C-alpha cells in the first residue's frame, strides 16, 4: 500500500464509526459472514502514549462477539502494528476527521481495506475516494451496507 495521510492527528479520529464498505485481495477474506476480514468497527480509541485501539464485532460461533485490539505506534505517524503470529500493519490512507476515514490491514500476501463513516447513511462522496484509493490495488471482492443494516449487531 502506497497511500498514507500526512499530518495525522490521531487524537481527532476517536469516537464512533460505521464500517460502510469493505474490500479484500482475496474473495475468502470477506467471503462468508465468518470470513477473516469481515470485522465490524464500533469505536476508535487512541491511548495517551499514541497507541490506537479498535473496538470491533465478529460473527464467530453462533453469534456476534465483541473484541478489542491494540495497534502499537511507529516512526511514521499513520502506520501501526499488531502483535499476532504475523507482522500485521494498519495504515490510515485518508480522513477528514468528521465524516469518513479510510484504512487498510495488511501482512507478510493478504490485504483488506474499509471506508468508515460517522453516521448510518450512504456518503456517496466517501465511496469515490475509497474507490480511487483501491484502483491502485489488486482487489477481488467488495461489499457495502445500507443504513438499516448499519444499526444492527454484525450488520444483520
Ligand X SMILES: CN(C)CCCN1c2ccccc2Sc2ccc(Cl)cc21
3-class DSSP assignment, residue 12: helix
| Residue 85 in contact with a second copy, rule: CB under 8 A | no
Q: 141 touches which of a second copy, ligand X, none (CB within 5 to 8 A by kind)?
A: a second copy
Q: Do 54 and 92 contact (CB within 8 A), yes or no?
A: no
What is the Cα–Cα distance from 11 to 26, expressed in whole angstroms? 32
The neighbour count for residue 21, using CB atoms within 10 Å, is: 22
Kind and range of the H or E element at 15?
Answer: strand 15-16
Which x/- pattern, by CB under 8 A, does the window 129-148 give for a second copy? -----------xxxxxxx--
Name which position in 14, 82, 137, 143 contacts ligand X (CB under 6 A).
82
Q: Which residues contact ligand X by CB under 6 A? A: 29, 36-37, 39, 54, 56, 58, 67, 69, 82, 88, 90, 105, 107, 110, 112
Q: Which residues contact a second copy by CB under 8 A? A: 27, 31-33, 140-146
Amino acid at each position: 500500500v502506497t497511500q498514507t495521510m500526512k499530518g495525522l492527528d490521531i487524537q481527532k479520529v476517536a469516537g464512533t464509526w460505521y464500517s460502510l464498505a469493505m474490500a479484500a485481495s482475496d474473495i475468502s477474506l470477506l467471503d462468508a459472514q465468518s470470513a477473516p476480514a469481515r470485522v465490524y468497527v464500533e469505536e476508535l480509541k487512541p491511548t495517551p502514549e499514541g497507541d490506537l485501539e479498535f473496538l470491533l464485532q465478529k460473527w464467530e460461533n453462533g453469534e456476534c462477539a465483541q473484541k478489542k485490539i491494540i495497534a502499537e505506534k511507529t516512526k511514521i505517524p499513520a502506520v501501526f502494528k499488531i502483535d499476532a503470529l504475523n507482522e500485521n500493519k494498519v495504515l490510515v490512507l485518508d480522513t477528514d476527521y468528521k465524516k469518513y476515514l479510510l484504512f487498510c490491514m495488511e501482512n507478510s500476501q493478504s490485504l483488506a481495506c474499509q471506508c468508515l463513516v460517522r453516521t448510518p447513511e450512504v456518503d456517496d462522496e466517501a465511496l469515490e475516494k475509497f474507490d480511487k484509493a483501491l484502483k491502485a490495488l489488486p482487489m477481488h471482492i467488495r461489499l457495502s451496507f445500507n443504513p438499516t443494516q448499519l444499526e444492527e449487531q454484525c450488520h444483520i
